[PDB]
Design an enzyme around this catalytic site. Structure first.
Site: not given
Ligand SMILES: COc1cccc(C(=O)N2CCN3C[C@@H](c4ccc(Cl)cc4)CC[C@@H]3C2)c1Br
Length: 289
Positions: A116, A233, A263
């Site tokens: 991740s 995922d 995931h």
């Molecule tokens: C417990 O948190 C966890 C658990 C598992 C995985 C993740 C993680 O790394 N992600 C899941 C969200 N996504 C959000 C994404 C994003 C950010 C801002 C905006 Cl405006 C739009 C999209 C950026 C990548 C992260 C990756 C997380 Br955070």
């Protein structure tokens, strides 16, 4: 005595102090004899190093010395929960720990294992030091965000919000999308070292920085790697695994897709978890013989 966020004195635990003077909780799994290689385990957002107990015991069983720490703001390490001044702090702190272990075990090859966000950290660490690492094992690394979450409109709106209320949080990540294994979802939901608070805007922006930096790093990545990715995922989009296979320059790169898997592949349905452990075992064994 400095204490963990759970009030345990650091003097009772394995630890290190990072460049910012913050204590990071450390975890080690060492074989009885001379290790064949070292491997750092890089955990993901909201979790901690203890989640890798079974994988680490398997790797130690292959005569590797496995080491890890809880990233700043996570688990038993110091820092405000799930925030970071800049994403590079995570990379810098991995390199500190790696450099300390290499000084104690000179000449041993060093591998990285990341899941991740921890997989983005591993990619950035290996791209910062080409030729330094012997290999990397990536389990659903953060390469591309969920495309429905990361639209231009929503990213621009989050950058505006971050400029005013950086500590504003969204809802929590839906833990039911972490794994089809509901026992593993229940374990995640009740682990006191996992952060299930909503993602703060400022940290969301750092995760977008990680995605951008990973994209620029792919043509610098020459390290051998094993890449494991679930097709369903919702957190680290499977398109990112295909992008990493296409854009990395590595001469030794392998992808395994787990059809229908979510995931957390190493905590998925038993058929998937057993395969993930077996594939990592074979891959690392072939490169440590
Ligand atoms: C417990 O948190 C966890 C658990 C598992 C995985 C993740 C993680 O790394 N992600 C899941 C969200 N996504 C959000 C994404 C994003 C950010 C801002 C905006 Cl405006 C739009 C999209 C950026 C990548 C992260 C990756 C997380 Br955070």
């Amino acid at each position: 005595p400095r204490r963990t966020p759970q009030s345990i004195p650091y003097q009772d635990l394995p630890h290190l102090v990072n460049a910012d003077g913050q204590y990071l909780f450390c975890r080690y799994w060492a074989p009885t004899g001379t290790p064949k290689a070292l491997i750092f385990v890089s955990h993901g957002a909201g979790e901690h190093s203890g989640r890798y107990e079974e994988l680490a015991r398997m790797l130690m069983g292959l005569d590797l010395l496995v080491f890890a720490h809880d990233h700043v703001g996570h688990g038993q390490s110091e820092g405000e929960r799930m925030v970071v001044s800049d994403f590079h702090v995570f990379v810098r702190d991995v390199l500190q720990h790696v450099d300390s272990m290499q000084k104690d075990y000179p000449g041993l090859p060093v591998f990285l294992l990341g899941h991740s966000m921890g997989g983005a950290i591993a990619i950035l660490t290996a791209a910062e030091r080409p030729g330094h690492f012997a290999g990397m094992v990536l389990i659903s690394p953060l390469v591309l965000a969920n495309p429905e979450s990361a639209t231009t409109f929503k990213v621009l709106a989050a950058k505006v919000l971050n400029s005013v209320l950086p500590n504003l949080s969204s809802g929590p990540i839906d833990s039911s999308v972490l794994s089809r294994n509901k026992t593993e979802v229940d374990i995640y939901n009740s682990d006191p070292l996992i952060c299930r608070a909503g993602l703060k805007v400022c940290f969301g922006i750092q995760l977008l920085n990680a995605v951008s930096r990973v994209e620029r790093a792919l043509p610098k990545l020459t390290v051998p790697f094993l890449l494991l990715q679930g097709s369903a995922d919702r957190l680290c989009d499977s398109k990112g695994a295909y992008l990493l296979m296409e854009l990395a320059k590595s001469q030794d790169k392998t992808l395994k897709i787990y059809e229908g898997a979510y995931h957390v592949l190493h905590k998925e349905l038993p058929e998937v978890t057993n395969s993930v452990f077996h594939e990592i075992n074979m891959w690392v064994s072939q490169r440590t013989a």
